C-alpha cells in the first residue's frame with residue numbers, strides 16, 4: 001500500500017556520469033562504451049549563446065580542448081563529432097560500468113527518471129514526464145546540462161532525455177540521445193515560449209486506478225460516459241483527448257479493479273466539474289498526471 | 305528552477321542489497337562489511353506473526369537456516385544474533401561495495417530516501433519523511449521488508465530506517481539500523497493504530513521558501529505574526545508547534561529570500577485560514593511538508 005512518485009534506481013546511470021569541460025564551460029556527459037555524449041553548447045561562451053553557429057564554433061575546437069574527467073581521472077579524447085545538438089566524444093577507454101542500453105525517443109505523456117548531476121557527480125534522482133508541449137518540469141540549476149532521463153527494463157537502461165536548457169518560464173528543454181530536441185526548442189538564448197501544458201488524461205486515469213488499488217475510493221461515482229462525451233469535458237479542462245488506444249492501455253488496471261475505463265472517465269469528469277471539495281486522492285489535492293498506466297502496474301506489482 | 309521531490313542517488317545503497325531467506329520467508333537484507341542486517345520477522349511463518357516469541361523462535365534456527373544471496377551468489381553465514389527487532393547475520397565475505405556509512409536514528413520531520421527492494425533487488429527510489437506520529441507514508445508491497453531509508457553527505461550513507469511492516473491503515477512502520485522501531489510499533493500482526501499525523505510546520509515553511517526562490521510569490525502577503533500567535537493557528541490546523549530552533553534552522557532561507565521567518569509564518573497562517581482558492585504552489589494544491597530546510601538549500605544550491 002501507498003503510492004509514491006518513484007524513480008528507477010540510479011546506480012546504473014551514476015556509473016556513466018562524467019564531467020566535460022570545453023574552455024571555461026563545464027557540464028555533464030554520459031559515458032557509454034568509448035563515447036561521451038554531452039550538449040553541444042559546451043563549446044560556447046555565455047556571449048556565443050545569443051546567436052551561436054555551432055559548426056563554425058566547433059571548427060576552433062580540437063580533441064584536446066574537450067576535458068573529460070571520470071571520477072577524478074582524465075579520459076583521453078581521440079575523436080569528436082557533432083550529431084544534431086549533442087557532441088559525441090570518442091575516448092580511448094571504454095566505460096567499464098557501461099550497462100545494457102538503448103537510445104529511445106519517447107512520446108509526450110511518457111515518464112522517466114532524471115539523475116540530476118553537477119560536475120559529473122550525481123546530486124539527486126526524481127521522476128518526471130515529457131509534457132504534451134514537449135517541455136519537462138524538472139529541477140535543474142546551472143551546470144546541470146548533460147544530466148539524463150531514462151527508463152529501466154530489468155538490466156537495460158533506455159536513455160530518452162539529455163538536459164540542455166531552462167526556458168525563461170522555468171520549464172526545461174532537452175534532446176533525445178541522438179541530439180534531437182523534444183518539441184520546437186533550439187539551443188540558443190532566445191525568446192522561446194512553450195505551448196499549452198495540457199493534462200495527460202490517460203496518466204490521470206492510471207493514477208485514479210492506483211488510488212482505488214490503495215483504498216482511496218470516495219471519488220468513485222454511480223456514472224459512466226462515452227469517449228466522445230468525456231472528451232467534450234476533457235477539452236474544456238485542457239485535458240488531452242482520450243483515444244481507444246488509451247482505453248486499451250488502461251485495460252489491465254480496469255481488470256485489477258473491476259472498474260470499466262469509461263466508468264473511471266465519468267468519475268474523472270465529475271471531479272473536473274465538481275472539484276475535490278477540500279478532499280485528497282493519494283495525498284494529493286490535484287489530479288496527478290505523471291504516472292503512466294505501466295508505472296501504476298509496475299509500482300503496484302513490484303517489478304525489479 | 306523547478307522544485308521536485310528529489311531522492312538521493314541510490315547506487316551506493318543498491319550495492320548493499322541482498323536477499324535473505326529463512327525457511328519459507330524471503331525478505332531483503334542490507335550487507336555492510338561482513339554483516340547482513342534484516343528484520344527479525346524473517347524467522348516467522350504467517351501464523352507466528354500473531355503472537356511471536358522471537359527469542360524462542362530464534363532458538364530453532366541455526367546459521368545454515370539463513371540463506372543470504374548477493375546477486376545470484378550465496379553468502380556463507382558464520383554467525384547470527386538478534387539486536388532488538390533486527391537480525392545481524394555474520395557472513396564470511398565482507399561487502400566489496402560497502403560505502404562509508406553511519407547508523408543514525410532520525411527525529412520526526414526529518415526526510416530520507418528509500419530504495420524499495422524485492423528479493424534483494426531494487427525496484428525504485430523515492431523520498432519520504434518520518435511523520436510526527438512515527439509512521440512513514442512509503443510505497444511498500446509484500447516482500448519489501450528490509451528495504452532501507454538513508455541520507456547521503458558526499459560519500460557517507462547514513463542509514464536511518466529499515467522497513468518492517470504495513471499497519472492496517474496502509475501506513476508504514478520500521479526501525480533504525482539498531483532494531484529499535486520508530487514510535488510505539490511492535491513486529492506483531494496486532495491492532496496498532498497510529499496517532500495524529502500532524503503537518504511538519506518547519507518543512508512547510510522551507511517549501512514556501514523554495515516556492516519564492518522558484519518564482520511562485522502569489523501567497524506572499526503584507527503581514528507578520530509572532531511565534532505564539534502563529535502557533536495558536538497552527539494548533540487549530542493540526543500543524544506542529546514552531547519553536548525558536550525552527551526559526552534558527554530557517555535562517556539561511558530567510559537570508560536567501562529577504563523574507564523574515566515570522567513574515568513567512570503570517571503568509572502560511574493566511575493560507576491555512578483562506579485556503580489556496582484553486583491556485584497552486586510549486587505545482588501542488590496542498591502545502592508540502594516533506595522537504596526539510598536542509599533539503600531546500602541542497603536542492604536549490606546543487607550539493608553533490
Ligand SMILES: CN1CC[C@@H](C(=O)Nc2cncc3ccccc23)c2cc(Cl)ccc21
Nearest residue numbers: 041049140141142164165166187188189305
Ligand atoms: C543562457 N543559457 C544559460 C546556460 C544554459 C542553460 O540553460 N543552463 C541551465 C539549465 N537548466 C537550468 C538552469 C538554471 C539556471 C541557469 C542555467 C540553467 C543554456 C543552454 C542553452 Cl541550450 C541555451 C542557453 C543557455
Ligand SMILES: CN1CC[C@@H](C(=O)Nc2cncc3ccccc23)c2cc(Cl)ccc21
Nearest residue numbers: 001345353444445446468469470491492493
Ligand atoms: C502480517 N504481516 C504481513 C507480512 C509483514 C508485513 O507487514 N509486510 C509488508 C510490508 N509493507 C507492505 C506490505 C504490503 C502487503 C503485505 C505485506 C506488507 C509483517 C511484518 C510484521 Cl513486523 C508484522 C506483520 C506482518
